[PDB]
Amino acid sequence: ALRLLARPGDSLYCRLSANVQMWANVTHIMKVGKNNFRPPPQVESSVVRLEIKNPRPQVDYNEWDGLLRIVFVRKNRTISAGFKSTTVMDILEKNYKTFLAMMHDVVKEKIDTVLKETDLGDKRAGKCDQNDFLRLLYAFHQVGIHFS
Amino acid sequence: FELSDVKSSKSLAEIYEDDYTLSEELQKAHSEISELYANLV
Amino acid sequence: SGLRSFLRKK
């Protein structure tokens, strides 16, 4: 529940907390001690109120699932470094060929460009706020890369 | 129901030997219980 | 005691 409450830029911010925050607004409510529940659970417990934004944001659930996984492999590593991992370019490489139907070193350079103008690649994935990923999500869409 | 926690005086051949060949001690209690009461009475 | 007694025995 603290993970869900974690804002963008928090150490406690997590790959989950981004999903729930943009699809819904989460408000912390009340804390219940371990002694309250019997047989006692070692884990601490909480109650939280969550409301889904209405109308639902007009964004594809998988696209941000695509962005959110690739860049939050490591929060404290750079977004570019999470990009720079060999595997993700390869997945993005088959992805780019799909849109052309709709040279791997070339797309990696193109991915490297959209990183440099955005400047989010240098910044830390956890530190970046939720709005930046929306702006970041757009730049790849403009270049023609959709993460999913 | 209790476990022995000391060295088993019987070796494996002997316990396997025992297996090949409600409780007697429990009746030995009953007999000596019976003997006392007849003496008490 | 404990490990100390064992190490003493050696």
Binding site: - | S11, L12, A13 | -
Partner: protein, 108 residues
């Protein structure tokens, strides 16, 4: 192994020896290694003697090397208990689990 325990091999035709080594279960070194060995033996050999009576085997704790003699299922019933102590389970808890397996042996 004791001679009388070894004679069971001549007496029986379905008794085997199971041998393994503590570092195979978990990489223990120094005093951590020594403590694990003590747990298998226990105080005054109480723990092994419990493993000995219930699972119907013999176990030789030769330094870090353990050898278990008995029937195939019985040596396997001995092995996990030995493994459990190595991985950190207290002797008291396994003594309870050990006395549980001791029951199903006598019913069956």
């Amino acid at each position: 192994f004791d001679l009388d325990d070894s004679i069971a091999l001549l007496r029986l035709d379905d008794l085997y020896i199971e041998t393994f080594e503590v570092k195979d279960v978990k990489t223990l070194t120094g005093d951590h290694l020594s403590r694990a060995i003590g747990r298998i033996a226990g105080k005054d050999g109480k723990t092994k003697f419990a493993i000995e009576n219930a699972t119907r085997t013999r176990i030789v704790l030769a330094d870090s090397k353990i050898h278990i003699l008995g029937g195939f299922t019985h040596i396997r019933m001995a092995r996990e208990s030995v493994v459990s102590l190595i991985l950190g389970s207290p002797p008291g808890k396994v003594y309870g689990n050990l006395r549980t397996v001791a029951s199903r042996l006598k019913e069956r």
